[PDB]
Write a protein that binds this ligand. Sequence first.
Ligand code: ADP
Lengths: 67, 71
Amino acid sequence: TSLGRSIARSMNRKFHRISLGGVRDEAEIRGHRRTYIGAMPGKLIHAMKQVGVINPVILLDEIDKRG
Amino acid sequence: PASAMLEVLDPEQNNTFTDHYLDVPYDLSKVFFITTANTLQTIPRPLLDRMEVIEIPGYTNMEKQAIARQY
Ligand SMILES: Nc1ncnc2c1ncn2[C@@H]1O[C@H](COP(=O)(O)OP(=O)(O)O)[C@@H](O)[C@H]1O
């Protein structure tokens, strides 16, 4: 994960870790249908919101660990 | 609501944070929480990374006698 900041600082691009692995369904990666009550977008586009640029760097941690 | 309370754990993002009902910048940075946890396995990895763990061993009957008598 420190390599993430090293590479980002080499690129001078914004870094933002996204906490995955503990998820269970598909409707959280991509926002569920607007029709279902309490519709919220997927965590990804949340990270895209957090950054103010179109070319940030995103780290996808520990992917190797009902929807 | 992980990031919902990461945004209040870290005093830097609360400089101009606006809640969905108040919609006005406010500085919630002077608070420094100390928390107690019952189970640690279910706590998210980023949350466990930013806190230092302190473990309470337990109690003995000899200690409990004095605890009850004096406290
Ligand atoms: N050679 C090294 N130089 C600098 N930091 C190192 C080195 N080896 C290990 N570290 C440190 O190890 C830690 C690993 O944390 P992290 O990258 O979050 O781990 P993980 O990728 O397993 O989640 C970082 O604080 C990183 O700086």
